[PDB]
């Protein structure tokens, strides 16, 4: 175990940048996305996953469950404005 409290290194993503860039590159309107931009888009994606998982978990906790099921994720997208952009994916 570490001897002190946890210290985050900022300015890095835990995602593989090349993979994130591949998704970015699919956008037909973007001329070029800078590396700095790709890093921020990657970190926002990390934060997005954490947010989705948290809301899914809270739904599960309501029905006294310990884990996330597919329908927890679905019900989140069904009920929450912030996740409207996922409507097609989940066929709501």
């Amino acid at each position: 175990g570490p001897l002190g409290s946890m210290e985050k290194t900022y300015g890095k993503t835990v995602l593989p940048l090349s993979r994130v860039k591949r998704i970015i590159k699919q956008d037909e309107d973007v001329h070029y996305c800078s590396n700095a931009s790709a890093l921020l888009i990657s970190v926002a994606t990390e934060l997005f996953v954490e947010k989705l998982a948290t809301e899914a978990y809270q739904l599960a906790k309501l029905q006294k469950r310990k884990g996330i099921r597919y329908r927890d994720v679905e019900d989140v997208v069904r009920k929450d404005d912030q996740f409207e952009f996922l409507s097609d994916l989940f066929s709501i």
Binding site: T9, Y10, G11, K12, V14, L15, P16, R19, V20, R22, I23, I24, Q26, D27, D29, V30, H31, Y32, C33, S34, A36, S37, L39, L40, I41, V43, A44, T45, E46, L47, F48, V49, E50, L52, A53, T54, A56, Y57, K66, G67, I68, R69, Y70, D72, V73, E74, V77, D81, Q82, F83, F85, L86, L89, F90
Partner: protein
Amino acid sequence: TSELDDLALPRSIIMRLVKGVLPEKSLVQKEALKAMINSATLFVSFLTSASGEIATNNNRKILMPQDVLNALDEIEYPEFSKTLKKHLEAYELALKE
């Protein structure tokens, strides 16, 4: 769905992000994790698109970090802004050294 699967970010990295915000020993179902992996891909596209629009509106060809920060407001995730600014600050600090 063939395209979503080819773009998908690694299952183990996404899983770690998911479990990082849940209590110890919480489980995450098969189709749930895949749901979130795919949602992540669309989020990349969603933020990228909104950022590209702001770049275009500024008659710029380069999508810049400030376009990403302003895109958060447009896609209504302004609660990510403080953290992204922190990463950006660190990025160009490290850069100049």
